[PDB]
Structure 1
Amino acid sequence: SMNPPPPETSNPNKPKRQTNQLQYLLRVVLKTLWKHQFAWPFQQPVDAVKLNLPDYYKIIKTPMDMGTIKKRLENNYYWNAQECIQDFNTMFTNCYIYNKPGDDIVLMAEALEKLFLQKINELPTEE
């Protein structure tokens, strides 16, 4: 089977704005998670062809990864911080859905998620 197209990261028809929350989501949240020791399987869309995961896209219908989230923040694709937070949550839950409790990839996702939740609990109030 083929991989689906990646999630859209840019759209010239969507309106754009700059907020302190979206700035914090790129500057603090994504930059911190990106450097984490267990971030590398989550830095690009799951390549089910190269990774030999033929049922991945039969089970995961809403794929999401940090490479996509970063490109969306860098392209001013998100209007609300909540859209970015939901993408981080979709990424984690996809991993828990496809994999099983105790799998190393799940342990890796759980560690990035705990860090994510710490940095999101310190999200600055909207200026």
Structure 2
Amino acid sequence: LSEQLKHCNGILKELLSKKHAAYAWPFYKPVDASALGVHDYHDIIKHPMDLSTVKRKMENRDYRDAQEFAADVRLMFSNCYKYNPPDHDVVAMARKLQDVFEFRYAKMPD
């Protein structure tokens, strides 16, 4: 990986670590629409994203730069903000996790 992608992988590891598990856990795996009974999810969300998919893409060297990585992580949060009411518990968790993401992403080495 490039230096910037290393930093991205570091952030990714952090997002998946125990210290953030209390609010990161909904984002660990792809939304299972049928299991959650949200039968309109895939009509509303055209591009599902989650941290296991980001991890797989990082491992497979799918991401060519930090920008592409960040777009996926942000897409994941956006999907949450799109589907759920602004006052929902899972949205609060998304906001907190994105705060973790954005502040460390900002420390990207040049």
TM-score (norm 2): 0.93
Matches within 5 A, 1:23-102: 23-26=6-9, 28-35=10-17, 36=20, 37-102=22-87
How many residues are aligned here?
A: 107
Say which SS state the counterpart of residue 34 (structure 2) adopts: coil
Structure 2 residues without counterparts, runs of 5 or longer: none
Q: Larger C-alpha radius of gyration, 1 or 2?
A: 1
More helix by share: 2
**Alignment pair present for 1:19 and 2:34:** no
Q: CA deviation at 1:102?
A: 1.2
- CA RMSD in angstroms comes to 0.8
User: 1:14-72 deviations in whole A, cap 9, x for unaligned?
Assistant: xxxx201111111x211111121211110111110111110000100011111100111
Moved segments of 4+, more than 3 Å = none
